[PDB]
C-alpha cells in the first residue's frame, strides 16, 4: 500500500504504472456475509 509522498506523486502525475495498484471488491448477497462464498 503506497502512501505519503510516493503515492501523492503517483496521483499528481497520471502514472500508467502505479507502485501498488489495487481493487476494492465489494460482494453482493450471501457472499458478503459468508466467508466460504467470499
Amino acid at each position: 500500500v503506497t502512501l505519503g509522498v510516493p503515492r501523492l506523486k503517483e496521483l499528481i502525475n497520471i502514472s500508467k504504472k502505479p507502485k501498488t495498484p489495487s481493487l476494492t471488491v465489494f460482494l453482493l448477497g450471501q457472499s458478503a456475509r459468508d466467508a466460504e462464498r467470499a
Binding site: 450471501q30 456475509r33 459468508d34 466467508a35 466460504e36 462464498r37
Partner: protein, 508 residues
C-alpha cells in the same frame, strides 16, 4: 344524562338547546356491519381502543373519588368494565399515570381479587397494597416454578425488578421465600429463585445482605453472623472475619454449614482467590483454603433439630486441590502444561472447577491474550472442555463464557485469525453440546443465524461438526430447534446432511 337534565328543568332556553342537541349511533352500526361484510373483531377492537383513548385523554383526578364518596358499590360500570380484557388495561394505565388515587386503587384491588392479573406495571399497580402485591407475586413465582430454567433465564429480569421495586416488596418476597424454603420437598427451587432475586438486588446497587443473613436462620451465633454481614456488605474478603470464622469452625463444636454455604460469599471468595491479579498472604492462605474446603466438603446429617455426623475426610483432598490450583493461579508464567494432569484431577471437584472457570474467564477475557497465543487452540479452552466433561452444573457458565468470547470483536487479530478463533470457540460449543447441554447451544446458534450478523461459514461449520458426531434417534425438541438452521437457504445449498434431512422428513 340528557334525560336527567330534561327532568331537572321540565332556564328553559338552555334546557331546550340541550334537548335539541341530544335529539340531534345506528349509522355507526351500519358502517360496522358494512365493514364486517367487506372485511369483524378488528372493527370492535379499534372502536374500543378509540373509546379508551377518549377516556384516558382528558383527566380523572377526583371525579371517581366523588362517585366513591357514597362508597361506590355500583356494579353497572364495574362488572361491565371488569372482564372485557381491555378496560382493566385502561385502569392500569390510569393508575400508573395518577398514583395514590383511592378509586383507582379500589379498582386495582377489585381486578386483583378476581385473579385477573398479568400486567406487571411495577411502579404503581403492582406494589401499592399488600393483597395486590401478594397475589401478583404468587402468580409470578408460580410461573417461575412451572416454567423451569428457560423461564428462569427469560423471566428473572422483569420479575426481580418488580419484587425489588421497594425494600418492603423485597422483604415480603424474601419472607415468602424463607417460609417456603423450609419445606421438606421443593425447597431447593425456592432457595434458588430467592438467590437470583438476592443477586439481582445486589447488582441493582441495593444492600440485601442483611435480609439474607436475618431470614435464613444464620443469626444463631451473633459473632459469626456479624462477621459474615461485614463480609457481604463490604464486598471484599477481610482477614479479621476469615480468622474469626476459621477459629470458630476449627472449634470443638462446629456451627451449622448453612451460612458458610451462601452463594454470594462463595462468589466473593472466587473473586478474592482465583483472580490472577491477587496476592493472598501466606498467613491467611491456608485459612482461606480450609474455609473453602469446610464450606464445600462436609457431609452433615440432620434430623429436624440438630446434627450428629459431620465428615471431614474429603476436606483434606479438597484443600489440597484448591491449594494446588491457587498455586497455579499465583504462578502465572509456560509451566502450566508441565503438570496439567494434576490440574485435571483437581478440576474433578466442582468448587475447584468453578474456580478454574472463573480464572479462565479472567485470563481469556483480558485483551491481548489470543494475540499472544501461538498454538491453534488455547490451553484454557481445553480447561473449559474438561470442566464441561467433569461436571454438568457448570454448563450454563461455560456457555455464558463461550458466547461472551464469541460475541467479542478482536480487532488486534487478523481476519482469518479471528475466524479460526471463532471456530475454536465453536468447537468448545460443539463439545458442550456433546456433553448433554444441547438445547441452549442450538438456541444460541438460531439466535446467531437470523437476528445476528455472524458469519454464515461459522454456522455451516457448526452444522458440519454437529452432524459428524450425532446419530439417530433424535427427540422432537432437538429436531425442531436444529431443522430451521439447516433450511435457511444460506446453509443447505452449500453444505452427511442428506441422511439427517431424510430422517427428519420421515420421522418428524
Amino acid at each position: 344524562x340528557x334525560x336527567x337534565x330534561x327532568x331537572x328543568x321540565x332556564x328553559x332556553x338552555x334546557x331546550x338547546x340541550x334537548x335539541x342537541x341530544x335529539x340531534x349511533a345506528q349509522t355507526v352500526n351500519l358502517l360496522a356491519e358494512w365493514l364486517i361484510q367487506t372485511g369483524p373483531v378488528q372493527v370492535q377492537e379499534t372502536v374500543e381502543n378509540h373509546l379508551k383513548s377518549l377516556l384516558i385523554k382528558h383527566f380523572d383526578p377526583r371525579k371517581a373519588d366523588s362517585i366513591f364518596t357514597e362508597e361506590g358499590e355500583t356494579p353497572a360500570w364495574l362488572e361491565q368494565m371488569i372482564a372485557h380484557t381491555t378496560w382493566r388495561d385502561l385502569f392500569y394505565k390510569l393508575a400508573e399515570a395518577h398514583p395514590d388515587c383511592l378509586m383507582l386503587n379500589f379498582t386495582v384491588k377489585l381486578i386483583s381479587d378476581a385473579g385477573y392479573q398479568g400486567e406487571i406495571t411495577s411502579v404503581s399497580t403492582a406494589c401499592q397494597q399488600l393483597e395486590v402485591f401478594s397475589r401478583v407475586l404468587r402468580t409470578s413465582l408460580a410461573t417461575i416454578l412451572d416454567g423451569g430454567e428457560e423461564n428462569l433465564e427469560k423471566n428473572l429480569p422483569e420479575f426481580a425488578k418488580m419484587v425489588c421495586h421497594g425494600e418492603h416488596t423485597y422483604l415480603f418476597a424474601q419472607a415468602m421465600m424463607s417460609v417456603l424454603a423450609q419445606e421438606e420437598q421443593g425447597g431447593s427451587a425456592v432457595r434458588r429463585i430467592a438467590q437470583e432475586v438476592q443477586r439481582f438486588a445486589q447488582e441493582k446497587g441495593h444492600d440485601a445482605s442483611q435480609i439474607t443473613l436475618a431470614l435464613g436462620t444464620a443469626a444463631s451465633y451473633p459473632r459469626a453472623c456479624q462477621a459474615l454481614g461485614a463480609m457481604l456488605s463490604k464486598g471484599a474478603l477481610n482477614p479479621a472475619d476469615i480468622t474469626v470464622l476459621f477459629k470458630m469452625f476449627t472449634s470443638m463444636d462446629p456451627p451449622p454449614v448453612e451460612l458458610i454455604r451462601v452463594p454470594a460469599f462463595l462468589d466473593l471468595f472466587m473473586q478474592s482467590l482465583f483472580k490472577p491479579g491477587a496476592r493472598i498472604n501466606q498467613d491467611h492462605k491456608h485459612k482461606y483454603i480450609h474455609i473453602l474446603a469446610y464450606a464445600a466438603s462436609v457431609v452433615e446429617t440432620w434430623k429436624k433439630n440438630k446434627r450428629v455426623s459431620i465428615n471431614k475426610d474429603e476436606l483434606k483432598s479438597t484443600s489440597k486441590a484448591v491449594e494446588t490450583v491457587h498455586n497455579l493461579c499465583c504462578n502465572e508464567n509456560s509451566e502450566l502444561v508441565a503438570e496439567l494432569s494434576t490440574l485435571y484431577q483437581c478440576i474433578r471437584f466442582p468448587v475447584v472447577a468453578m474456580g478454574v472457570l472463573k480464572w479462565v474467564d479472567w485470563t481469556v477475557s483480558e485483551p491481548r491474550y489470543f494475540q499472544l497465543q501461538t498454538d491453534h487452540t488455547p490451553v484454557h479452552l481445553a480447561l473449559l472442555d474438561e470442566i464441561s466433561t467433569c461436571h454438568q452444573l457448570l454448563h450454563p457458565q461455560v456457555l455464558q463464557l463461550l458466547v461472551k468470547l464469541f460475541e467479542t470483536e478482536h480487532s488486534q487479530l487478523d481476519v482469518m485469525e479471528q475466524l479460526e478463533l471463532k471456530k475454536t470457540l465453536l468447537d468448545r460449543m460443539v463439545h458442550l453440546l456433546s456433553r448433554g447441554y444441547v438445547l441452549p447451544v442450538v438456541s444460541y446458534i438460531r439466535k446467531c443465524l437470523e437476528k445476528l450478523d455472524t458469519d454464515i461459514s461459522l454456522i455451516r461449520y457448526f452444522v458440519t461438526e454437529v452432524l459428524d458426531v450425532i446419530a439417530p434417534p433424535y427427540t422432537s425438541d432437538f429436531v425442531q430447534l436444529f431443522l430451521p438452521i439447516l433450511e435457511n437457504d444460506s446453509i443447505a445449498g452449500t453444505i452427511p446432511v442428506t441422511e439427517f434431512i431424510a430422517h427428519c422428513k420421515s420421522n418428524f
